[PDB]
UniProtKB/Swiss-Prot annotation, chains A, C, N, O:
Tissues/organs with expression: Widely expressed. Expressed in adult and fetal brain. Expression is slightly lower in fetal brain. Expressed in skeletal muscle.
Subcellular location(s) per record: Cytoplasm, Cytoskeleton; Cytoplasm, Cytoskeleton, Microtubule organizing center, Centrosome; Sarcoplasmic reticulum membrane; Synapse
Domain observations: The CAMK2 protein kinases contain a unique C-terminal subunit association domain responsible for oligomerization.
GN (gene name): CAMK2B
Protein family per UniProt: Belongs to the protein kinase superfamily. CAMK Ser/Thr protein kinase family. CaMK subfamily.
Induction annotation: Activity is induced in skeletal muscle during exercise.
Organism of provenance: Homo sapiens
Range of residues in the leader sequence: none
Function statement: Calcium/calmodulin-dependent protein kinase that functions autonomously after Ca(2+)/calmodulin-binding and autophosphorylation, and is involved in dendritic spine and synapse formation, neuronal plasticity and regulation of sarcoplasmic reticulum Ca(2+) transport in skeletal muscle. In neurons, plays an essential structural role in the reorganization of the actin cytoskeleton during plasticity by binding and bundling actin filaments in a kinase-independent manner.
Subunit structure: CAMK2 is composed of 4 different chains: alpha (CAMK2A), beta (CAMK2B), gamma (CAMK2G), and delta (CAMK2D). The different isoforms assemble into homo- or heteromultimeric holoenzymes composed of 12 subunits with two hexameric rings stacked one on top of the other. Interacts with SYNGAP1 and CAMK2N2. Interacts with MPDZ. Interacts with FOXO3. Interacts (when in a kinase inactive state not associated with calmodulin) with ARC; leading to target ARC to inactive synapses. Interacts with CAMK2N1; this interaction requires CAMK2B activation by Ca(2+).
Disease: Intellectual developmental disorder, autosomal dominant 54: A disorder characterized by significantly below average general intellectual functioning associated with impairments in adaptive behavior and manifested during the developmental period.
Name of this protein: Calcium/calmodulin-dependent protein kinase type II subunit beta
Span covered, complete protein: 534 to 663 of 666
Native organism taxonomy: Eukaryota, Metazoa, Chordata, Craniata, Vertebrata
Length: 125, 119, 125, 119, 132, 132, 132, 132, 132, 132, 132, 132, 119, 125, 125, 119
């Protein structure tokens, strides 16, 4: 019912990363963002500044499989989905990479803000 | 308010290390989701999966906690799990694991709705 | 709605294998059963007789994750689920094994019969 | 009735080998599920996943088919996919894959609702 | 139609090997039997005697629960008293460690009906050698 | 008698070595079954599988080769049926320029249809001995 | 409260190394600087001169887009003009092949406030050596 | 001056070598941070982490060891603050019975509280040199 | 004719498998030449060379074995001379307890002297197939 | 006495192979020739055709100065028109690199005198295959 | 005092890094002894040994290098004698273009003769740190 | 002339280590002793205490017959009360297996005559570490 | 005359296999030279070297002898030594060695003046 | 005394091989020559014909060390010497090769003939 | 002529080492003895003291092959011989070891004294 | 007297490094014996063996000499040969060799009668 909005906002964020448009990513993310990801080497990154590097510095298509949104109150949600990223390597052969993601959401003045983001498996930068 | 979230997380961790499921079951939401290395990159649907490990010398340390409080009855702690143990050879070993636990306060006590584990 | 019956009948079959009760397995399966599984070495096995071997010849717990039942007509269904089998090895350490399963179902005189069964990943015999 | 299921399966396979998506899209059910080696042990939710491979010398052979017909408008074919191709070195190679396709006849033509692929 | 008899006679022969009863094997096989098999090291063995070794030297201590499955048969019937079955041999057994194992072998058996019963004149075997 | 079966087998083999499919297609039964190392332990149905190896054969990779048929054993059944079980010693020259030999154990089941002998089944152990 | 100044001064120093501006590094560091780092091979280097090498010998051809992140800081304030920050150095860069790489290094910097600005008296570094 | 800091460091080291935690606990600040090889590139918070190594030390594994503190460099700040940066040459005897030496680069930040010196932070590169 | 040569060859082979030299000595010509893998590419003169393998055979190492003579080709010359060229498929059981097959290509030149057939020369390629 | 003729005829055959003149080889060999040789992969090749390959596919670019030596001959004469020579083949040649190499091979040739000239009915070869 | 010994040691080191022998020859005693890794565990007598490394240094192999003298310990004896025991951290850039550090433990015995300090003995453990 | 006293005092020290008598070693060595040796892992150890470990932890069960030889000495005499000997240490011993072994080590010892007896202020050692 | 040289060579060989030096000493010339693998490519000066091996199940076979007779009291035999023995594992092994023995008939019996051994 | 003639005739033969003059080698050798050498692969070669190959198909210098001539009768000798052959490899570096030789000699109508020749170690062809 | 005395005195010394009688070795050797040997690790040992170790701390037989004595003056000689030492290893198998030796001799008050001793190849301690 | 022996040894060494045989031939005794690594553990009989190396950037250093003087016209020097050279790669290398040279003064100049070389 309300979980359908959380999945749509998650796609927008993912599309911002695949397209490489930071201004869209920055809007959907909470300036005070925490994140565990394989690129962080088992550390909790504090800023946008960490992610900006990957934006500022190939045909791909992300698929969001088996979503599970835990809705809390009026303005809080926790989606736990799988990230099947399809891309083409330098050699020219097509490759798929699986990554398990958890994104904690907080609705602030209308739009949904991303406060925390967990990522297991392959890095998608 | 974040200090309460860290205390409830320790209780849950202690329940796993002590092997007391009834304590784990209380602190966890019966409708629990979880990504963990044991799940082989799948989202387990709750309790019954964990029960297996309970029914069938260590010291856990919770480093660099970061609690994101949302509303009155919602929190998201993102901490590191440094588990110290002793191998079969007899030498002491440490294992690092990155954990995210999403919390929901229901009729007083804090319930764990989702749990992520890397490493 | 009707998919909930297919998931329950699948659990009964799985439980029959874990418990090692063939008579229950034989009832839920169609005597004319086809099956691709890792034990078959990429061949389509024809009988119960193949499975009987594993029954006639350890604490485990199977979990059925991300089910997807395709209902066709009144008496036909196709469930596509993941088999997370938790067990304890000979050394005494606990192990988990993932296997992707597809079971095609056919309702005959009340009870659901299993006509075909696909299994990718780890064998659970 | 099983002879129709084998013919429709060939059309789909030929659509993939020829790289004509419009033919693949017609024969497949928009709400398509699929276990395949490319999915990394996950159940893909349909079309968009496959489109990638289409948009971005071989001969396929369909060995030992086994069609389970259910009702008037339902079938389950379980066949082997012997795909013959030529490697970069120039030598010819064969690759075996075990496939299960669940079919549903909708307004005349057969639609593919589920597709399993091992090997 | 007539191919169903060829598959039944093939099972009897296979069961004779799994059970280790040579007299049954000897009856179903043609005394002038040719055979390519992995045990022969790429040679065509003559009639019987070669196989007897595997039957006779089978000890009860090494006797393991096994079950053979005959998958995707293809019987080519020629005349009234001749047939050629080409099947796959999925042999399920339990190793010395106690774990269950499966072994695939591709078999071709040429049959000749003599005074009622079917006689095996030639036998080809690729893959794993699946005599106990 | 058996001498006709060995001659027809050579024609088929020569069709593969020369890379002339039309000759291969004539001598083979359109409904052909076959176990061979290229099939990965499966029973192929059709010419279509074999056509690939004929058509994709380049003249640049065309090497001087000579097949030898050793220790034949033809089992004649009725008037229009035969089963030859022979060894295929294929002599060729590798890309480096050195001469190499490859052994393969073959069983071909034959059926005489409207004059000429047709190949209904074909088994092959050892090395895959097709120019490709 | 006062720890926020220590984290800001640490960033300035780090930025001086990433930008390759020694004059800024020299100002923020105490001329009598001690340092354990992976480049020192388990020795305590004396004040400056050792570091100058890495600044001066940095060529523009090898100049790579890099971005340092300071994670989980822990500032121990002592008196009015002394601090000890213990932080993790996640350095993001792009290798010669063109692929992006991250390198972790555990750092401890002991600070001493002299005539206004903070001076770095000691510097410890575990893990990867992350000077260009 | 600096001579007091080196003496207090020896007491702490001796507490670890002797395996007496109560002495270690006294000399260390309950709010202790620490980078060490056992922490896997993380900053540990507490005694609790260290207690494990003291308590789980068996008398059967108790080996004759002798620590040497080489090239100390004490940075004194104010009246009640110091930063020693020394090398830890730990001499021990392995299970085989042969004598072995292990080098580790250490930085310990000290704070004098109600008389005795308290250890607030502790850095360790190289070998983990705790009896276990 | 050639059937007598194959029977006498079996007697000789059986004498080696049974380890009865007196039978071997009778069937062999005292002036026997032989190329075999045990000779290291030399032509041995005498029984004396072979006697070693018979006499030094222990009962503890005595294994169930069965030799098979495949694709014989006897070249008869005059009344009292023959040349058999056969393959020796020796089936045995290794120390581990598993069954093994070993191929060896043999040529034996025969000479009929005062009734019984005498072996004047013996060639052996492949595996040395004597119980030892 | 009569053995000297057998050694001379063997040299002629060997020289025919080294010179690459098949017509001379074909004359000295019996059209119904059997042969065990390393090139045959432990099989008994039929008469001619197999050998022709090595003669015909010999290129002038790969033509190397070679010299065969026949050491320790042992001719077993049977009747008037039958002989069995067992000799060693030391073939001296020069490799592609330009260095001289020697290769040993143990040979047995069974001879039959037909209308004057000696015909070779069987030929065994162990060790190195020494056809250009 | 000891500060003069460290300055004269730098001059000598700089003479080796710059490749100016005349400066090295002046600062060294013509009757110089030396243990170094290049000597293969022997005590070299003369400049002549060292001259080789100076003279055979090519400008093509000339790399940007910087030596650092860490933890000096000068033992002054009388008016005209000193013994410095220091560590040689030599920073350089390899042929691949990556920066490398090499540690070497050095002992230099000094003797003040007609004003300037002369080097009578020189010990070197670890890496040989001469541009060559 | 005066160098003969330096070689005798060096032997006394060496004999103190081989005999395992520390009190004799302690007398001949300067309490403020520096030393580079292979056991120190490229560090300069402080005075005594480091060495005591090797003396005290020497067990009688591991006590092996050893004999040190001082080859090619070179004593540099400075003033009245200073000397620098540079010698090779050929230590002969017997391993646990019982076989005799020799170990080479290049040593430099700087000497200072204090109230009669010669005191050792510095000691360098390359090659094998030759303390029991 | 060559048949006598082969018989005397067997006696010498048998003396070594049996380990009877007095027989070896008689058949050998006190001034004996010898190249053998034990000598490490040096020419041993006689008896005393061999005595060591005597003082501190096999069957030797002498294949392809070639005796060069010179004058009345001189011969040069060049033969192959196929020595059959049993290894520690219990399996039978053969070892080839190429030998040249130069003979000199002195007061009746044949004396061995030189002995070469390859392999 | 008489052994000095045997060493001189051995040098002539060796020089014939190093110079590659067969006619000189053929004269000094007995047409019925036996020989064990490393090139023969542990066989006794019968002819000149074997050696001719090496003649018909680089700066070297042979040295004859520790000769030991056993003189028998008037026309028989047995020299046992070491062959230190110095040569330069294809790379251009100088190499030495040791070979232990025994040559049995027979004086026929004046000149010494070589009836047998043994060679251990390295081949000098 | 005079070289025969040098070979006899060399045997006495060798026998003293094989028998393990130092007093005999000490007499035949010059107290001021130099020596290059494999045990010295490419150094020139100065004393008896080095050798004493091996004496103070198995059936063997030494053979002295191809001696070459260079006689200088009335009381000086230089023998250059090969040391073929035959022994039995711990396993029980017989082994031979070659070593090239040079011993410089000086006749002092009757008996020959050994002033220098070189040894290449295998050590015989 | 030992200082003359060391000077004559340098002249000989320099003759080898410079490749001037006439100088080497003068300083060496025509009846020269020599153990060296090139001889493969054999005693070479003089000149002709060495000539090969002469007819078909380095710096030699003579360390720790020890001259044993015997009579008026005899000496035995035992020294170490540290030869410095540059490999094909271009890096500098050192090679150690232990040498013993026995000297005999004949009509003025010192002649080399024997020469040992290890390493």
């Amino acid at each position: 019912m309300r979980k359908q909005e959380i999945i749509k906002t998650t796609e927008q964020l993912i599309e911002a990363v695949n397209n490489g448009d930071f201004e869209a990513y920055a809007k959907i993310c909470d300036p005070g963002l925490t994140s565990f990801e394989p690129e962080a080497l088992g550390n909790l990154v504090e800023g946008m500044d960490f992610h900006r590097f990957y934006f500022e510095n190939k045909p791909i298509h992300t698929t969001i499989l088996n979503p599970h949104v835990h809705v809390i109150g009026e303005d809080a949600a926790c989606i736990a989905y799988i990230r099947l990223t399809q891309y083409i390597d330098g050699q020219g052969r097509p490759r798929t990479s699986q990554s398990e993601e958890t994104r904690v959401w907080h609705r602030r003045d209308g739009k949904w803000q991303n406060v925390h983001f967990h990522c297991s498996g392959a890095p998608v930068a």
